């Protein structure tokens, strides 16, 4: 599960240094992840996107970046974050309601 560090959706817990795995993070999307995983029945590993971007497309290189990118290039299986549902993205990936 890929996600971005954006309060109050996904934030670093107080004693995140003394924690590991998914317990390190807390927020709206962090809870939303557990809920989705419960109704879909699957284990997950919360990971922060590298470049820390959402999902844009460089005109020149025509390359996707951020979470939307990590989805198209098989880096992640799903994106649980404040990702805006745009036409430019709906063409390359799938957006739930």
């Amino acid at each position: 599960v890929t996600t971005i560090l954006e309060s109050p959706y996904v934030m670093m817990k107080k004693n995140h240094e003394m924690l590991e795995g998914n317990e390190r993070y807390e927020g709206y999307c962090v809870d939303l992840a557990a809920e989705i995983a419960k109704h879909c029945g699957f284990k997950y590993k919360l990971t922060i996107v590298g470049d820390g971007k959402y999902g844009a497309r460089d005109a020149d290189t025509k390359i996707w970046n951020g979470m939307v990118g990590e989805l198209v290039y098989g880096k992640a299986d799903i994106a649980i974050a404040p990702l805006t549902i745009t036409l430019v993205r709906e063409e390359v990936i799938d957006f739930s309601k």
Partner: protein, 82 residues
Amino acid sequence: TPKGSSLGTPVNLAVLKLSEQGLLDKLKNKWWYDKGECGAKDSGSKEKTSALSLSNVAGVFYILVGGLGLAMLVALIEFCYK
């Protein structure tokens, strides 16, 4: 979710299920208002305050000195005509 994924449909329905159970609204309230620190409906519910300043009273002081000055002007002219 990646185009043509297996988690596609399942997650979609899951989101709809969560919203109808009011779980989504609940989560937002948890991180926005509940976990919040500010307050608006509580600041209006706070019946307490009282103290006089000077601002309002000051406006009446300027109109006074203005009247005194106007008189000091009417005085001078009177002595001149006489």
